[PDB]
């Protein structure tokens, strides 16, 4: 896999990214279809993944932590002193 | 005459009466020191006033510059005349005049050091044709003004050669088909290349592609289609292809109607690859890809050449195109 | 409108070339005898278009004024050539000879001599066309394309129309708008296609949409529908009556419309647009090389679920479309479009190798 | 050329340039064979004829430069060939100026 | 893409440009925007398969020194958004391994890890020639992996503000098939040993130093054939001391032990078909909190 | 020498020389009685 800003794993090979309830044959519709009729009659007897995709893998999955991360630092800014 | 305005008026009257009596050699042979710029301006004003049927004021300016040793001025005048002819008419005559002007400008630029290889935009101005009714008498064109010097962009020798190549390609298209002059006057480089390929002017097509730095995928597809048609055709198709390919390659082996055009096309591809690049294999890649898309493996001499070159690329391409037996034998 | 409907409803004007000659003489003599009337009608149409625009902008209903006489005459002159079975090419006499379309091969002779003057009537018509190209009324955005389609019939007429389109296109400002710009422009058509692709991506940023969040304008506005149908039919007529124009518009270096049309055919689009794109692709593949390229692209993209070794039979695609929307609309043009497309493709290029390099030749599923 | 006929000389030159005979070693001499027909000033010369002649000569020299090598030249005659090309262009300019003078003086 | 044999792709410093060294005798370059990706560049000129290409620095210039098979390395140059060849270095018998660059204040020196039984160092100023030096007589077999030291002096030591100047002295480590691990240091032309260790009982496969961008902590992660993953961490002051700390008793041959952009997170890739991010918690030692595919 | 690094540099140098000559002749005509 690749690398990024410290704890930021990008895509490069095979990894376990973010999961989403949208696989084939599930509850309440949600289906898909792959490249099934592509190899017909004569073909190359070799299976391999095709194409690529650039996705992200995170672990926070929270949008309300901004206040919890800013308010303590907001109060620390008052007690902080510049040293120069 | 001491008065400058009266001198200019007298020069204008002299130009008028000389163009009326058809006596241009007098003004050509008459030298003009210091007042050369005034004479040039007077002739330019006369050319902007009248049309181009009464002699050629721009050719007279070119002759005067040649007599007074002004190669850059002569080249700029020739380029302006060519641009005006192109804006007036886009037909075969206009294309020929533009080609002549481009060639004269290139010669004038090469006659001097490369430090003057770039020229600025010519002097603007319109040529009012036929004073009386309509100021613009264009049978196949719009207006008659050269590109103004607002966008300061000096035209390099590369751009001049590109314009000359485009004009000569338009002229060749018009010669190969009279009903395509006005079409090529506004067509695109890709359409020009496709027309040259479908006609048989592969030399000019390759020259245009090398000058434009474009791609050769369409040319390779056309060549593969022609090879397939020659392989699946008969003696009539062979003769029809010879009638257009008899003047393209260097006839090293004596040509005859016995052998088909397969070896001729092979030697043509060899010569084209040697003239292009002896190391780049993208041309061979596209050729064999189009051949496999048509439905026939690459010839034995292509096989031998690319085997003496590489091998893993052949194995990968065979595994991708489902040539399992050939790939297995080759890797063994 | 009355005379246009009465002529269309009858088939008596189809025969006798003298009738066509007389109506052409009438059409050519109307503006020569009505000088300031044409300018007055143009000003009234512009005022009505501005009023309709301001009404639809402020929320009020668009006023239906009786100043559409120009559009009615244009509809008449466009339907006349479309219903006339003869082939006299009235566009050659209607347009100005100053457009880039000559057959020269000499120096200063044979349609190559300079310092010439076109006919005064044709010069005035070209000047009127150039004046109407700028500040186009919003109420005539569709009749212009309709009449362009009607006049594009014929080889030389289509060549003249392509020359006019090439002269109109380029770096312009009053040729890329709708309520104040002319739709006849390569850049205008390209920006329209880009806007429609952006609307489709806003609906769903993936191929084959499964749900529409909001109804776009193209589908609920009849003006956009008429404009798209008119432009597509005009392009189809151009590429059917001419080959150089087709090659020029297919080998564009600015943008590639082939991939856009392929994606639109892969995705869900109304059946009228589907049939229009199918016949446009057929007229494109009328040439052998274009036919081979289109056949390769079709074999690689798989519109019909071709099953020879594996693949879902009767899956989502042309079959589902013709069983759903065609059956709902009780009209089946898609079947005829697909049939004529595959017929032309087989006629122009035999399937010597099906697919790219991972298939085998076989017409068994078809 | 010994019997003196510049019109026939130009005609034969155009015919040879359109026929393309012999390889490059003789194409060089065929392209050089033009100065004796260009340094002259007598004999009636047509402006359009001189224009088409110089256009054909420039097209032939461009085709020769393109066929020798892609955007370069070979052999050992480089500076001499460039000087010959320059002097031929100068003679051609003088000849076309004389032709323009003659065309302007004929219509008197 | 996935149909080829991609070793390890690279990303631009900004994070919008991606480069894959595919096995198609070429290097592809995509521009990732919004969602989908678009292939823009296709650099052709690498004989055989391409190992990996390391990035340079934005303040010094974009340089992507590619290393491929057939014993050759190609240094390119970018202008007006277009890349073109500008230097080619060949002339080796054994297959060259991988190449790496230098950090910020350390400079811009390219280390050519050749398995010819010697070391080849290519120093480049910025727009001139390339100084190629060869330190011969290494040991029996050629080297395998090479790594550099941080820009400052080796040894994690707290310095005073406005009192530390990063010198231009060079310090590097080279690990090959010799059952040992060494470290060389030079004063701009005087390579010499520093310390010696005898703890590895098998053939050392690879080594990787972690120049932390934030602290001068020197830690080298090594991997062999059996699976002895020793974390040689030096946290003293200015001397040299390595402690053999067995991370995990592996049973494979790990070939890659990459470090994050801050040299704090370690990504292991070898013969385990998985990647376990054994991050360093806030109390030393190790902790496995994430495991993904290879 | 000023600029003269490429075609644009040589063009700028020529323009600067022309402007210098024009300014010189203008200031000469101004210093001289008109």
UniProtKB/Swiss-Prot annotation, chain D:
Family membership noted in the UniProt record: Belongs to the nucleoporin Nup85 family.
Function, in words: Component of the nuclear pore complex (NPC) that seems to be required for NPC assembly and maintenance. Involved in nephrogenesis.
Protein name (record): Nuclear pore complex protein Nup85
Location of the protein in the cell: Nucleus, Nuclear pore complex; Nucleus membrane
Subunit structure comment from the entry: Component of the nuclear pore complex (NPC).
């Amino acid at each position: 896999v690749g690398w990024g800003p410290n704890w930021t794993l990008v895509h490069n090979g095979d990894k376990l990214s973010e999961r989403l309830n949208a696989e084939e044959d599930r509850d309440m519709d949600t289906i898909d279809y792959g490249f099934l009729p592509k190899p017909t009659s004569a073909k190359s007897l070799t299976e391999s993944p095709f194409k690529v995709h650039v996705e992200k893998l995170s672990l926070e999955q929270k949008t309300k932590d901004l206040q919890s991360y800013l308010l303590p630092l907001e109060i620390e800014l008052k007690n902080s002193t510049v040293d120069k | 005459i001491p008065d400058t305005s009266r001198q200019l008026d007298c020069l204008r009257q002299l130009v008028v009466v000389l163009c009326e009596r058809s006596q241009l050699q007098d003004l050509v042979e008459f030298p003009y020191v210091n007042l050369h710029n005034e004479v040039v301006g007077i002739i330019e004003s006369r050319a902007r006033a009248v049309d181009l049927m009464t002699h050629n004021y721009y050719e007279l300016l070119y002759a005067f510059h040649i007599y007074r040793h002004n190669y850059r001025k002569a080249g700029t005048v020739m380029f302006e005349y060519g641009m005006r002819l192109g804006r007036e008419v886009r037909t075969l005559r206009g294309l020929q005049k533009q080609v002549n002007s481009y060639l004269a400008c290139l010669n004038c630029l090469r006659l001097i050091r490369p430090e003057y290889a770039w020229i600025v935009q010519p002097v603007s101005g319109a040529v009012y044709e036929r004073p009386g009714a309509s100021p613009k008498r264009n049978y196949d064109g719009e207006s008659s003004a050269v590109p103004s010097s607002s966008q300061i962009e000096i035209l390099e020798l590369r751009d001049l050669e590109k314009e000359y190549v485009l004009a000569q390609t338009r002229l060749t298209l018009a010669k190969h088909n009279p009903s395509t002059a006005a079409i090529a006057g506004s067509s695109a480089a890709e359409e020009m290349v496709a027309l040259l390929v479908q006609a048989g002017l592969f030399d000019t097509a390759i020259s245009l592609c090398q000058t434009f730095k474009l791609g050769l995928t369409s040319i390779f597809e056309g060549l593969a289609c022609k090879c397939i048609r020659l392989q699946q055709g008969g003696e009539a198709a062979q003769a029809e292809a010879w009638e257009w390919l008899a003047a393209n390659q260097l006839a090293t082996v004596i040509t005859t109607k016995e052998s088909s055009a397969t070896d001729e096309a092979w030697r043509l591809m060899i010569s084209y690859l040697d003239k292009y690049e002896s190391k780049n294999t993208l041309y061979h890649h596209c050729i064999i890809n189009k051949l496999l898309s048509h439905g026939v493996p690459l010839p034995n001499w292509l096989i031998n050449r690319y085997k003496a070159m590489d091998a893993a690329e052949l194995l990968r391409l065979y595994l991708k195109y489902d040539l399992l037996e050939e790939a297995a034998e080759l890797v063994l | 409108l009355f005379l246009t409907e009465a002529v269309v409803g009858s088939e008596s004007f189809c025969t006798d070339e003298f009738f066509i000659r007389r109506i052409h003489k009438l059409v050519t003599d109307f503006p020569t005898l009505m000088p300031m009337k044409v300018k007055q009608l143009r000003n009234r149409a512009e005022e009505d278009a501005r009023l309709i625009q301001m009404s639809m902008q402020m929320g009020n209903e668009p006023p239906a004024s009786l100043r559409r006489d120009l559009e009615h005459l244009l509809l008449l002159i466009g339907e006349l050539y479309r219903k006339d079975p003869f082939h006299l090419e009235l566009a050659l006499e209607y347009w100005c000879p100053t457009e880039p379309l000559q057959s020269t091969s000499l120096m200063g002779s044979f349609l190559g001599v300079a310092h010439q003057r076109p006919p005064q009537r044709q010069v005035l018509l070209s000047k009127f066309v150039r004046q109407m190209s700028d500040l186009l009324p919003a109420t005539l955005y569709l009749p212009y394309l309709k009449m362009l389609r009607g006049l594009a019939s014929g080889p030389q007429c289509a060549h003249y129309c392509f020359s006019l389109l090439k002269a109109n296109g380029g770096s312009s400002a009053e040729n890329l708008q709708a309520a104040g710009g002319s739709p006849v422009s390569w850049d205008h058509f390209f920006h329209s296609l880009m806007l429609y692709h952006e609307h489709l991506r806003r609906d769903l940023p993936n191929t084959d949409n499964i749900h529409q969040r909001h109804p776009p304008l193209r589908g609920i506005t009849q003006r956009e529908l008429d404009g798209l149908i008119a432009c597509l039919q005009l392009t189809c007529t151009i590429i059917d009556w001419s080959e150089s124009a087709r090659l020029a518009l297919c080998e564009h270096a600015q943008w590639m419309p082939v991939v856009v049309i392929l994606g639109l055919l892969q995705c869900s689009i109304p059946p009228l647009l589907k049939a229009e794109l199918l016949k446009t692709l057929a007229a494109f593949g009328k040439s052998p090389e274009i036919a081979a390229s289109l056949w390769q692209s079709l074999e690689y993209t798989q519109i019909l679920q071709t099953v020879r070794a594996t693949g879902l039979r009767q899956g989502v695609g042309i079959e589902v479309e013709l069983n759903e929307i065609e059956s709902r609309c009780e009209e089946y043009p898609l079947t005829r479009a697909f049939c004529q497309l595959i017929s032309t493709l087989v006629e122009s290029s035999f399937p010597t190798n099906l697919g790219a390099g991972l298939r085998a030749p076989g017409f068994e599923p078809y | 050329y010994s019997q003196e006929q510049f019109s026939e000389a130009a005609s034969l030159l155009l015919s040879l340039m359109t026929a393309r005979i012999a390889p490059c070693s003789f194409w060089l001499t065929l392209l050089l064979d033009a100065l004796p027909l260009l340094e002259q000033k007598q004999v009636i010369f047509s402006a359009e004829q001189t224009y088409e002649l110089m256009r054909c000569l420039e097209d032939r020299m461009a085709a020769k430069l393109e066929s020798t090598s892609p955007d370069e030249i070979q052999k050992q005659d480089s500076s001499i060939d460039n000087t010959k090309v320059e002097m031929l262009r100068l003679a051609l300019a003088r000849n076309l100026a004389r032709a323009i003078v003659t065309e302007g003086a004929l219509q008197e | 893409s996935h149909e080829d044999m991609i070793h390890d792709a690279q990303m631009d410093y900004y994070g919008i440009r991606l480069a894959t060294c595919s096995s198609d005798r070429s290097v592809k370059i995509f521009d990732v925007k919004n969602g989908g990706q678009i292939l823009i560049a296709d650099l052709r000129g690498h004989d055989g398969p391409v190992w990996q290409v390391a990035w340079a620095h934005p303040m010094y210039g974009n340089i992507l020194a590619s290393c491929s098979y057939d014993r050759k390395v190609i240094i390119w140059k970018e202008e007006n958004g277009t890349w073109e060849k500008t230097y080619e270095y060949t002339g080796h018998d054994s297959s060259v391994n991988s190449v790496c660059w230098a950090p910020h204040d350390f400079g811009l020196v390219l280390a050519c890890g050749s398995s010819d039984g010697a070391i080849s160092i290519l120093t480049f100023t910025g727009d001139g020639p390339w100084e190629v030096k060869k330190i011969s007589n290494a040991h029996t077999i050629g080297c395998n992996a090479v790594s550099w030291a941080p820009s400052v002096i080796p040894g994690s030591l707290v310095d005073q503000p406005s009192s530390q100047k990063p010198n231009y002295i060079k310090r590097f480590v080279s690990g090959g098939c010799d059952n040992l691990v060494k470290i060389w240091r030079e004063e701009d032309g005087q390579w010499k040993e520093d310390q010696k260790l005898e703890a590895h009982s098998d053939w050392v496969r690879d080594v990787a130093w972690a120049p932390s961008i934030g602290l001068p902590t020197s830690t080298i992660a090594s991997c062999s054939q059996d699976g002895r993953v020793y974390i040689w961490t030096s946290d003293d002051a200015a001397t040299n001391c390595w402690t053999p700390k067995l991370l995990h008793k592996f049973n494979d041959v790990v070939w890659h032990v990459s470090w994050s952009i801050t040299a704090n997170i370690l990504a292991v890739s070898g013969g385990d078909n998985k990647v376990t991010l054994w991050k360093e918690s806030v109390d030393g030692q190790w902790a496995c909190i994430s495991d993904v595919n290879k | 020498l000023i600029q003269c690094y490429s075609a644009k540099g040589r063009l700028a140098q020529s323009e600067m020389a022309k402007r210098v000559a024009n300014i010189l002749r203008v200031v000469l005509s101004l210093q001289q009685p008109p």
